[PDB]
Amino acid sequence: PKSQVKRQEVISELLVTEAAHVRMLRVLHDLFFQPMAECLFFPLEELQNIFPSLDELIEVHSLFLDRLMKRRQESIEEIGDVLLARFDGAEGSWFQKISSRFCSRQSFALEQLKAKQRKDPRFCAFVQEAESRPRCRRLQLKDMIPTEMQRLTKYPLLLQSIGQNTEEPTEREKVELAAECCREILHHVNQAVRDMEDLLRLKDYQRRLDLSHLRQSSDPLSEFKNLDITKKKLVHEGPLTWRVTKDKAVEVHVLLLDDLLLLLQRQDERLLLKSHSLRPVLRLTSAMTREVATDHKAFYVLFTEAQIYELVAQTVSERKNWCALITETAGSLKVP
Question: Rounded to whole angstroms, how far apart are CA atoms 166 and 171?
Fold first, then answer.
């Protein structure tokens, strides 16, 4: 007291909220996943990408719910040991593995479901009917899926304040270490999320890429034979206008990647890279941006034979934003 009331409260909050989460996850499973498996709305492989590890994700939280209850029941001093048992060592590692799998596919999972609802009325009516079942507690499926992430972001907050309210030192170390683990996990999942969100997107572009032109120029482009972008970092993308001369302008979708800049022409579902002059592909290791005094909406990118690429955004703010991003990424790149 007063350290103790808070410590007990927080430990309570953690147990209760852990149960609610298991409960939801089970609803998600029972009312959505399993029935859809049985109605075979998707081929199963795919359902597994929408709910990447639901079955075992339920278990991991379940096992924790279980430790926490056993501990409460047998009394609360000491909780560190329990915490470390879920977030640290091998069980630590698994929890991460399982929760991050499932979290990464969130965005994917959602658009998949949205597509199907807007495309197939049998399925849309299914989801409605399911969403009206009491066990939903007024959450929609779209509300359910992203709770796993939320839950992960809650753990450091909860653990941080059990620790800072632990009087006895060696116990507070445990609880502190545990909390640290949770931030390690959160930080990793967050990353494995962007890695997936980028990946799927880059694989998308990579099969839509009309590569024929580089294989055709005598332009010693020969480095992009063969160009692969699936395993690279997508820093930024956006429509722009590409004033190849002050008489001719090209409509273009730009990808700013870790180390290359790509100016893509959109032609039906295709995306072309055409040498039309000035190349469409560019090694950033040399890049540099400038304002254009006669056009607050336009800027220049230069490759330090010049090599001038006059690009224009719709809004002034966005072209401020573009230069900002290029020069910054450009800078991030090291000289041998």
Answer: 7
* Radius of gyration of the chain, Cα coordinates, nearest whole angstrom: 26
Whose CA is closest to 219, among 158, 160, 273, 164?
Answer: 273
Residues 6+ apart with CB under 8 A from 78: 71, 171
| Residue whose pair of structure tokens reads 């690429």 in the numeric block | 309
Helices (H), 74-120: 80-87, 89-104, 106-119
Domains of the chain: 1-210 (1.20.900.10), 211-336 (2.30.29.30)
Residues sharing a CB contact under 8 Å with residue 86, sequence separation 6 or more, in sequence order = 60, 63, 64, 67, 92, 95
Question: The tokens of 69 are what?
Answer: 């209850």
Preceding omega of 4 cis (within 30 degrees of 0): no
For residue 176, what are the CA distances in angstroms to 72, 95, 172?
Answer: 20, 18, 6
Helices (H), the chain: 3-27, 34-38, 44-50, 54-73, 80-87, 89-104, 106-119, 121-131, 141-144, 147-163, 169-208, 316-331
CA distance 208 to 230: 12
**What sign for the dihedral angle of Cα 213, 217, 219, 222?**
positive
Q: Give CA separation, 305 vs 160, 222, 287, in Å.
A: 56, 18, 12
